[PDB]
C-alpha cells in the first residue's frame with residue numbers, strides 16, 4: 047500500500063569509486079576495462095576485466111574487516127557512501143527494528159574458499175586456515191558483514207540469483223516496505239574479482255577472448271562481432287525508504303520505484319528464453335501509466351543473450367520502444383553487483399537528464415535494426431526509466447523508477 | 453491479507469530419506485551421526501558428521517544432474533517428494549506464472565569451487581574445469597537447478613543467511629502469497645557435506661572434537677559437557693500455498709503459517725546476542741491467540757549458543773515456557789538446510805501428536821533449570837508450534853505453525 051523511494055546511493059565500480067566519478071565516466075563513455083596479468087597467468091583465454099581502481103587497505107576498521115572478503119568490502123564502502131548521501135545519522139538507523147538490510151553476491155568468495163582448501167592441505171592444516179574463512183566465504187557474507195557493524199536490527203539476509211542478484215535485493219526491499227514491516231532497507235550487493243571465479247566462466251566459453259590486445263573494445267554489446275562478456279567486480283548500495291518517512295525527514299528523493307518484476311524462464315540453464323523477460327517487463331510496467339523514456343538493458347555482449355533481450359523488448363513495446371543503451375559495454379559484467387550498479391547508473395541519468403551511450407558498436411547486429419540504441423551521450427529530460435537483470439537458471443528481474451512529482 | 457498453509461513436504465536428512473523414515477527416527481530418538489573417514493583423512497579434529505545415507509546415483513536424469521552440486525541434488529529429491537505429497541500434477545505447477553520457488557544453501561558448493569581451482573591449475577587447464585562448474589558453485593545453485601527442470605515460471609531466487617537460510621526462504625514464500633503475487637511457492641534448501649567446507653568450521657573451533665569414539669553422543673544440546681556442533685548435510689522442501697487455492701483443490705493441509713519473524717542482532721559476527729532472538733520470537737507471535745505448545749530450538753550444542761537461546765526463551769515465556777527439544781542432538785547441524793528440515797520435523801510432531809526427545813543430556817546445564825525441556829518421546833496433542841533458526845552475522849528467523857480449524 048505504501049509508496050517506496052530511493053533516498054541515497056553508494057557505489058564502487060570499474061568506472062568510478064563514488065557517484066561523481068561514475069557520473070563523469072557515463073557522460074564521457076569512458077571504459078573501465080583493463081588488461082589483467084592475473085587472468086593471463088592463471089592460464090585463461092580471457093585477459094581483460096572491469097577492475098575496481100582503489101586500494102581498500104585501511105579503509106575499514108581492523109576488527110571489522112577481518113571477517114570480510116572483497117565482495118563485502120565493496121558493499122561496505124558503498125553503504126558508507128549511501129548513508130552519507132541519504133543524510134542519515136546513527137541515532138536514526140542504528141538499533142532500529144524498522145531498518146533492515148538485504149544485500150548479496152553471486153558467488154560468495156571463491157578466493158577464500160580455495161584459500162581454505164589449499165591451506166588445509168598443506169603441512170600446517172587447521173592452523174594455516176585460520177578462524178575467519180567461514181564469514182568470508184559463506185553465501186550470506188555480504189549481508190552478515192554489513193548488518194553487524196552497522197548495528198542493523200531489522201531484516202538481515204542475502205538474496206542470490208546469479209546476474210540478477212542485487213536487482214532482486216532491491217525488489218525484495220521494496221516489498222518489505224509495502225508490507226509495512228520496514229521504513230528503510232539498505233539494498234545492494236558486491237562481487238569479488240579473481241581468477242578463481244573467472245576461470246569457470248572462461249571454461250564454459252562465456253568470456254570475451256578476441257580482444258585482449260585492445261581491452262577497452264572487448265565489451266561491445268550489440269556489435270556484430272561481440273564474443274562474450276568481460277567479467278568485472280565491485281559493489282553498490284541504495285537506500286530504499288517509505289515515502290512519508292522520507293518526506294518527514296526532508297530527504298532528497300532520487301526517484302520512486304513504481305514497478306518491480308520477478309519471473310522465471312523454466313527453460314535453459316544458461317541462456318535466456320526471452321519469454322520470461324517479456325512477462326517480467328510487463329509485470330514491472332503494470333499500473334505505470336507514463337511511457338518508459340530509457341531502458342538500461344541487461345546486454346552483456348554475448349551472441350545469443352543480447353538479441354534475445356532485444357526480441358523481448360520489441361514484443362513488449364511494439365512500435366513504441368524506448369531509448370536503449372547497455373552500460374556493460376563501458377563497465378563490464380559485475381555479476382551479483384550488476385543489478386544495483388545499473389540501477390544506480392539509471393538513477394544518475396534520471397537525476398542529471400542524460401542518456402549514457404552504448405559504446406563500441408562498429409557494426410550493429412542485424413537484429414538490432416530499427417531500435418533506438420543511443421551511441422552518443424544525449425541530454426534529455428527523462429521521467430521514467432527501466433533496468434533489466436537476467437541470470438543463469440532463467441531468473442529475471444526488472445525495476446522501473448520514476449521521478450517524483452515536483 | 454491472504455492466509456498461508458503448507459500442503460506438502462519432502463526431506464532427505466541424516467535421520468531419514470523421506471518423511472516415513474524421519475518420523476520413525478524422531479519417535480525412537482535415533483541419532484544420524486556417524487564416524488567420517490573423509491573428515492579424519494583431511495586432517496580435521498572433528499571426525500563425526502550427519503551424512504545422508506542414500507546412493508543418489510541415477511535418481512536424477514543425466515542431462516539435469518550434470519548442472520548440479522549435492523545441495524541441489526538433495527533439494528531436488530526433496531521437491532519431488534513434496535510434489536507427490538502435495539498431490540500436484542505437472543499441469544498444475546509447471547509453466548504457471550502463479551507458481552514459484554525460493555530455496556537456498558548456506559555455502560553454495562565449496563567442493564566444486566575447489567575442484568574448479570584445482571583443475572585449472574593442472575595440466576589440462578580449462579578442459580579439466582569443464583562447462584558445468586558455474587551452476588554447481590554459484591550461490592543460487594539450489595534455486596536455479598530446480599526452477600529450470602521443474603518448469604517454474606513465477607518467482608525464482610535463493611535467500612541465504614547462514615544457519616537461518618531455509619527458514620527465511622519459507623518466510624519469504626509466505627510474504628509472496630500474502631502479497632497476492634503467487635498461489636504456490638516451493639520453499640526450502642539444501643547443503644552439501646564435505647571436508648572442503650567442514651574444515652573451515654573446525655579451524656574456528658566450532659565443531660565437536662571430544663567424542664569421535666562415540667559419534668552418536670557428540671551432538672548433545674543443553675548437556676553440561678557439549679563442545680560444539682556436529683556438521684551435517686541434506687535437504688528439505690515444503691509446498692507453501694494460499695488457503696483458498698489449497699482448499700479448492702482438495703489438498704491435505706498440515707498447518708497454517710500464522711507467524712514469521714526476521715530480525716538482526718547488530719552485535720557479534722559469530723555469537724548470538726539473545727536480544728535479537730527475543731525480538732524475533734515476539735514478532736512471530738504477534739496476533740497469535742493460542743499458546744505455543746512446542747518449540748523446536750536452534751540449539752546447536754555449543755557452549756555459548758545453547759544458553760543464549762535459553763535465556764531469550766525465558767525472557768519471552770518466563771515461567772510458562774513451552775515443551776522444548778533440540779532435534780540437532782539427533783540430526784546434527786545441516787546449516788542452510790536446518791531451517792526447512794526442522795520446520796518439517798515440527799510439522800510431523802504436530803501432525804502425529806508427539807514431542808521428539810532432546811537426547812544425549814546426561815547432565816543438564818544449570819542455565820536450563822526451570823524450563824520445560826523434554827528428554828523422552830512424549831505423546832501429546834499439539835496445536836501450535838514454533839521453530840527458531842539463528843545464523844552467523846546475527847540473523848534471526850522464527851516460524852510459528854498452527855493446525856487449521858478442524
Ligand SMILES: *C(=O)CCCCCCCCCCC
Pocket residue numbers: 151152153156207208209210242243246381382436437438565568585586589590591
Ligand atoms: C549471470 O547470470 C551470470 C552468472 C553469475 C553467477 C554468479 C557468480 C558465480 C561464481 C561461481 C564461481 C565458480
Ligand SMILES: *C(=O)CCCCCCCCCCC
Pocket residue numbers: 179180181183184185558559562613614615616649652653787788842843844
Ligand atoms: C550457522 O549460522 C552456521 C554457519 C553456516 C554458514 C553457512 C555455510 C558456509 C559454508 C561455506 C564457508 C566455509
